[PDB]
Amino acid sequence: SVSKGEKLFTGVVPILVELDGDVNGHKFSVSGEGEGDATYGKMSLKFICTTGKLPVPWPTLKTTLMQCFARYPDHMKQHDFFKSAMPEGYVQERTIFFKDDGNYKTRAEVKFEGDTLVNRIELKGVDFKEDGNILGHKLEYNAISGNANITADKQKNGIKAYFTIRHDVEDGSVLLADHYQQNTPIGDGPVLLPDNHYLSTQSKQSKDPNEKRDHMVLLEFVTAAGIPL
């Protein structure tokens, strides 16, 4: 027996995201909603800080706030761990090390609740500088793109990923955010353990002009690559 989780993604899937965060004791929550269309690698999303002003920059939360919506080429479909874990889902854990600043540790469960793909997340950040580029809100609000490298993790029946995001800082410098990721299935069914490959993300990031809450609107396109036909 093999998984049939990928069949859950052939159409447009509603998305719901919930995050509770605590960075240097500053607590906050974020909710998000939108839709995923994995056939085209697409997600349309809007996130809102439900506790008032977000105490860290939106760009620092982007990667934390659903690699199951990636478009895998037909010739790479046997390497799509993320959909194979569905509907029971996966746990996604990261540590994100911000160069010369603190780190985020995140734990998420990504799974279906009925027809909705839900991403529930805890985030804890420690050791940040109150006057640094993060807690001081010195990061440009601009889209991020680029690659997430994926490798099998057979010992955990899952995957690992690694990549670094280069956040633009308002002084023209770059803040490097070194990501280390581990995903494990929640259910006990069959999963796909991939050969090495990457996910490439193209993003367009905006504000809703009528929205008074602190928020972020994204249009993301994510494609698997790195294995030749």
Beta pairing class for 116-126 and 13-23:
parallel
Cβ neighbours for 74, distance < 8 A, ≥ 6 positions apart: none
In angstroms, rounded to a whole number, what is the distance separating the alpha carbons of residues 208 and 210?
6
Q: How many Cβ atoms sit within 10 Å of the Cβ of residue 225? A: 15
Please identify which residue in the block is written with the tokens 């761990």: 81
In angstroms, rounded to a whole number, what is the distance separating the alpha carbons of residues 151 and 148?
10
Question: Based on the structure, what is the number of domains in the chain?
Answer: 1
Q: Method of determination?
A: X-ray
In angstroms, rounded to a whole number, what is the distance separating the alpha carbons of residues 109 and 97?
21
In angstroms, rounded to a whole number, what is the distance separating the alpha carbons of residues 13 and 205?
21
Resolution in A: 1.2
Q: Which domain holds residue 221?
A: 1-229
**Amino acid type, 100:** D
Task: Give the domain CATH number at 37.
Answer: 2.40.155.10
